[PDB]
């Protein structure tokens, strides 16, 4: 069974950085990527970005190029997200997600088929 | 950026009832439309991904269909279980980009 064990609820300062984990159990860690998303207040899902665990490999919403950085941990089975420069606007709940096998070679669906329980950060003055 | 709009916003029906959900991309993504469901605890599973195919473990009472820019997800026999959020996602762009989401309600 597939897990994703996401880090504690943390309360951080504005214009900090963070940095928060996704533990990996059940599966492969290196043949699946790792998506990063974040979710407001009732609202929709945005997109930050994923990892290559196995090549390292990122890539970047444009709207996160600045905000995020993703990193991978091989042995400890771990995905990390580092947030810097911290405002209410990050405040949000932020997920972890697997990247489901793909279509073929080279085609993706990009449908994140197992989740972790989220995150949540709550910056404040 | 492809743009994701669901509708209704929120749907309230009732046990053992047939529902169906809509979802427009802003171009076509070429069924590369992917079926979220959120319960209030926080927690996100995939349901069904490119427009019409059965996550693992996911109940055949969930059905999808739609091509290009037009999509929907279908529940026959709402179950209590079934009360929670549903978003589309299309994955045919980057980046991924998800839909405002529909409240199903009893
Ligand atoms: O493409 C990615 C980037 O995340 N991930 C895909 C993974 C990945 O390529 C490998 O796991 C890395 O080792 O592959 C996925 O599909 C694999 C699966 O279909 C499997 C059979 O169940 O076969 C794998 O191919 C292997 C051949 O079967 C072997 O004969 C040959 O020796 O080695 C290859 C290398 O793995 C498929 O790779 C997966 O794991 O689900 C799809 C992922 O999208």
């Keep these: 069974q597939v897990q994703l064990q996401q880090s504690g609820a943390e309360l951080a300062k504005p214009g900090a950085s963070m940095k928060m984990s996704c533990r990996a159990s059940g599966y492969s860690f290196t043949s699946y990527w790792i998506h990063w998303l974040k ?10 970005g994923y990892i290559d665990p ?14 995020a950085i993703l990193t991978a941990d091989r042995s400890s089975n ?23 096998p ?24």
């Design 39 to 48: 979710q407001r207040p009732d609202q929709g899902l945005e997109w930050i």
């Design 102 to 125: 793909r279509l073929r070679r080279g085609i993706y669906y990009y449908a994140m088929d197992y989740w972790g329980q989220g995150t949540t950060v709550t910056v404040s003055s």
């Design 78 to 100: 771990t995905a990390f997200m580092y947030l810097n420069s911290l405002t209410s606007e990050d405040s949000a709940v932020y997920y972890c997600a697997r990247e489901s």
């Design 54 to 67: 196995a090549t390292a490999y990122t890539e970047s919403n444009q709207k996160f190029k600045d905000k």
